[PDB]
Design a binder for this molecule. Sequence first.
Ligand SMILES: Nc1nc2c(ncn2[C@@H]2O[C@H](COP(=O)(O)OP(=O)(O)OP(=O)(O)O)[C@@H](O)[C@H]2O)c(=O)[nH]1
Ligand SMILES: Nc1ncnc2c1ncn2[C@@H]1O[C@H](COP(=O)(O)OP(=O)(O)CP(=O)(O)O)[C@@H](O)[C@H]1O
Ligand SMILES: Nc1nc2c(ncn2[C@@H]2O[C@H](COP(=O)(O)OP(=O)(O)O)[C@@H](O)[C@H]2O)c(=O)[nH]1
Ligand SMILES: [Ca+2]
Ligand SMILES: [Ca+2]
Ligand SMILES: [Ca+2]
Ligand SMILES: [Cl-]
Ligand SMILES: [Mg+2]
Ligand SMILES: [Mg+2]
Lengths: 422, 336, 52, 439
Amino acid sequence: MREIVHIQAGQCGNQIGAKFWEVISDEHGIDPTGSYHGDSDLQLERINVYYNEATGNKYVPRAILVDLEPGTMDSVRSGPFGQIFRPDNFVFGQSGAGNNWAKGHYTEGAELVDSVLDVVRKESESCDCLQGFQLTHSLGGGTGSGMGTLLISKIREEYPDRIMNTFSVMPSPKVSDTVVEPYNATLSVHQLVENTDETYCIDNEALYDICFRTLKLTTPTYGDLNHLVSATMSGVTTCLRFPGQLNADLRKLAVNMVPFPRLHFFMPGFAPLTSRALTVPELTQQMFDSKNMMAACDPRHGRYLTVAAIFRGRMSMKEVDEQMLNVQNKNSSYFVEWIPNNVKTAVCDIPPRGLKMSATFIGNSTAIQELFKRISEQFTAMFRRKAFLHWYTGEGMDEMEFTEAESNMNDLVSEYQQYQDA
Amino acid sequence: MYTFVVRDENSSVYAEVSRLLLATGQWKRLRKDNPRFNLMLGERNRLPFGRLGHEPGLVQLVNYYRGADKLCRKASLVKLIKTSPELSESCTWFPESYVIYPREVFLAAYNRRREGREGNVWIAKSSILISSEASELLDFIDEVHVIQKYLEKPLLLEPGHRKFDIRSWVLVDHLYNIYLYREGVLRTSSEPYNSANFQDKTCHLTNHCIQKEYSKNYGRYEEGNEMFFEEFNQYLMDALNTTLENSILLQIKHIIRSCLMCIEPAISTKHLHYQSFQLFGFDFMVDEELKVWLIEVNGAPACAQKLYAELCQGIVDVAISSVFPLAPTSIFIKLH
Amino acid sequence: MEVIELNKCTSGQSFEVILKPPDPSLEEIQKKLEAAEERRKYQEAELLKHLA
Amino acid sequence: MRECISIHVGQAGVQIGNACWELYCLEHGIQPDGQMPSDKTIGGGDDSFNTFFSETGAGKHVPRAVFVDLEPTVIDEVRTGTYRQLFHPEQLITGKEDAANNYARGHYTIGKEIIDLVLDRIRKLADQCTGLQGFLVFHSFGGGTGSGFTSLLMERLSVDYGKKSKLEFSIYPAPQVSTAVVEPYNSILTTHTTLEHSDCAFMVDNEAIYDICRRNLDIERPTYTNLNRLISQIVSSITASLRFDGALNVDLTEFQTNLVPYPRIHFPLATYAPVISAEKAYHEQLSVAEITNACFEPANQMVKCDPRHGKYMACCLLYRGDVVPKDVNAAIATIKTKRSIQFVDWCPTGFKVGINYQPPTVVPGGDLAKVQRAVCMLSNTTAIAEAWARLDHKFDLMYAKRAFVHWYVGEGMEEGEFSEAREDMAALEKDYEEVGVDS
Ligand SMILES: Nc1nc2c(ncn2[C@@H]2O[C@H](COP(=O)(O)OP(=O)(O)OP(=O)(O)O)[C@@H](O)[C@H]2O)c(=O)[nH]1
Ligand SMILES: Nc1ncnc2c1ncn2[C@@H]1O[C@H](COP(=O)(O)OP(=O)(O)CP(=O)(O)O)[C@@H](O)[C@H]1O
Ligand SMILES: Nc1nc2c(ncn2[C@@H]2O[C@H](COP(=O)(O)OP(=O)(O)O)[C@@H](O)[C@H]2O)c(=O)[nH]1
Ligand SMILES: [Ca+2]
Ligand SMILES: [Ca+2]
Ligand SMILES: [Ca+2]
Ligand SMILES: [Cl-]
Ligand SMILES: [Mg+2]
Ligand SMILES: [Mg+2]
């Protein structure tokens, strides 16, 4: 359990992936040329989880960049850390996917997927012991959604005993590019339910609400949303990137977080929410606050199956333990009693950039069903009149596939309800 | 905010205690199978003591002493008194008692009384038969029991020529302080005592349930068959020129101290990973020489209806708020 | 309370104080392991069939 | 002289083995390079310390030990640490991918792939033995390797070394330092599979060690290093009779003879005193009576439970330091007149006592203070079943919903193994009830 292979697909996927790589390259002391300039061996101890070592002392992200149009990947290649990526790991087409899951999954994406898998195979072949894959993508568009889920299916076929992890951005009418986003997201969720082991549900609705209400950003941009996304991703991969006892690899994380195979959709949170000194009680209180959740769900509307908490910085571990025990003991009704000791806590000494301490939250809550109910309502409002279906039937899809995707997502919601009532 | 659970729905005392804890605004009741509690009001039978004190960040307290059953079962109490050097077979406030299974010792002492013309009336009970012939008692058992010398010369209230027993409530906190509730109660018989007819078990058994059914004078002298300490002390003064404290309460306190201090090393939670308290009901008899005898100890006693409020408030004050503090004229006498 | 079986040496001593008188075979193991391996292989074959 | 082979499985077992062998080297005067100046027979001998160390012609004293882990990061610390020169590479076995806190993954998926290598490396140590008496197996209950691979190894050791005794040192799961929600599952599974193959198992509840460190060593948030130094002191107290001259518990068979009258009830409770902080500059040296009294206080037990509400079947007192039998007997008399020490009635009410004059050794720069005398009591009491009750309750809570069961089925295990193991645990609790409780 060592190397992770990273894949970023589509516009959203590549932008949040580029920001993620910038953030963790800074955290590990890697400059945009791939050279290490840190001051602590803690930065290098597990560097091989995400980086290959190249000729000299160069570190190259084990990252594969995929899109069906070149624009966003040209912008990545011109970005601050653009030169750090392996040039051969850029795999792009020209047609684009036109925000069409069917184009991403069945036609345009099918034309590109084999060369993407060739790059995946080359990266895996030079892995001492591949853990699995992490994919960044959105569910509302065409390339990320459709071709990412296609890539997930193919990778599962070629690596059935490896862990599949995704960071999946859920569409929201508050921050929407097209009306067919509920179609694309509903089609994607079925694939994720069947073919991922862990999925961080990053809800654009929640990101917008945070940027507007909490960060006092009048006009949030995708950059402002991606600031939260990158901070959260750095938080949730800390246990994979630094020495530690708890959730130190993808499979142990999955075993700790997933009591039932389909219920593997995580609600992430971050504290403090930034755009100068937090105490541990404040960190804990804020990290369990709904206003800090990256999925627009009220946790007090459901129950926690499992929780992972990651504290970063130099702080009293005694006080961290006390505060986590405090939160559990004073709100025990919101933790299922049939999974004893379902809250696990990690502490890493190295804080993120700009902060002296931070806390990252990963909850498997039955309240996540509200996100899927929201998507299902927006799906049904158009599907009952077969609106905008011609974009998809023109690519070879039939209505039955939409009916089945709707059915399965309703089943997912019903399963969350069953365990919320258990 | 403190948290507690309720696992005995049939306890009036701790129903009232739960009510009081809730009405403080600083206690929150959880589901009965939630392990993250500060306080367990546990079940009478098979309380899972082995699962207490293993919750990090939680000081856990339970309203029962593990092992106190040794004091609160008939046969267990008899064996404990006879075999504990602190109490000994020479103990002078516990009636002569023997454990019989469905013997030779019992018949030996009984024969000493037989060929001594002495009062040879015994009682047989368990967890009831009164007879002067041993064969009838032994035959009744076979159809685990205790056979105990029946006090043929009880102290009789007047008017009515009637028998009684005294119930004392005793709270033992987590520090093994012993608190005697200042309010006891006399469960009285409403029928005149009849030393020539143990056949009728209504003037001989002072139990409230037995009186309230088999006694035709139930409620005549007091309500219902309960005499409280002020009236009983006034009666002792008027009739026998003594006080309740002098004639009876000193012996009661001595007996309570004796039993609880005897079993302290076996049940104390002083250095334990969880803490215990418990409310006990001691039942005493008084003979005509104003000598107090211990009859039994109840591990889960009820209270006299007019005393529930005061006693349960005293419970939450002494046993619970001492461990979990909230944001004189004590109702307890501290025995030491 | 009696002491018995007192043994003394240069490095210590032991005694006893009384206060009061009164398998599966290799083949079966390999069978279990191979049964589990075959159930794994069957689940993976079912997965690959579904993906096909 | 009869050799003992130590086998350390998983992270917990390997790190506790590190601590134990460091302590052994300090206790026997073996330097980190394997040299032992006080050993005047070069290249061989059959001294008591040779039960645990073999000897090379160059004068190196090599632990009779195998380290097994399914991932390499913990054993690499042995390979690179202070006592690296102590071990030869064939003693340190690592895979590349661990059992991910999954009993089924440790026992079936990966164990089937590494068991033969482990057995061959153990055979190579056994071939150096003129009269191997058996094995001491160190492992966690909660980890995937520590549980599943340990159970597999115990079965195969019963097959290959039928006549040899096997003792366990088992780390019982505690949520304050645990890393997996499914640790109750793993604990019950490995206990069911191992029960027939272990002759004597010493359980150490991480909760007890954690609280002892907090309370007596004034460590606010103890680490595995603190816990393992304390655990290694207790393990050394237990194995000192095998490693030094003496008449009591001098071969593995004597552990079973003295501590285990019934084969299934083979989990002795260990209690250790005194635990004193090195930071505490002024310290009052505790007498034999005081430390013997401390053996009957639950706060000093390796597993939190109440022996006063159980029954004893065997009791050994293992003293180290300035201790004489007259003072031992005086302390026992005093304690008997004051404590609830009830034996089963088909067993004598007695203590088997051993005294090693060498006071406990502590690691320089450690947390434990050097004391003039210490004692470890091993008593087989039914009260230890409280831990089984706790574990079985957590198991039942998760298994009623089949929570996490798919992770085990996915590795080739059948769901029936869960209920079969749980029924074995229920029969064990019932055995403890029958032996320990009156009607
Ligand atoms: N006392 C003590 N307990 C430990 C130590 N290391 C791990 N544990 C405990 O053991 C349990 C976890 O099992 P591990 O030994 O870490 O797992 P493993 O044997 O390596 O198995 P896998 O990692 O799943 O392959 C948890 O309850 C930990 O608290 C240690 O060094 N000392
Ligand atoms: N040696 C004795 N002499 C005189 N009366 C006795 C006696 N032993 C018992 N009694 C009478 O029996 C009545 C109650 O019997 P007992 O002691 O068994 O309590 P109980 O079983 O009714 C309540 P519980 O068992 O629920 O605690 C008392 O009123 C008492 O007068
Ligand atoms: N947080 C975040 N969301 C984005 C970003 N870009 C697009 N999204 C969302 O993702 C959906 C469009 O997906 P997109 O990636 O642009 O389509 P694709 O290129 O075909 O995969 C819509 O819901 C957008 O709101 C981004 O940069 N950051
Ligand atoms: Ca777009
Ligand atoms: Ca084309
Ligand atoms: Ca030698
Ligand atoms: Cl053999
Ligand atoms: Mg009564
Ligand atoms: Mg491990």
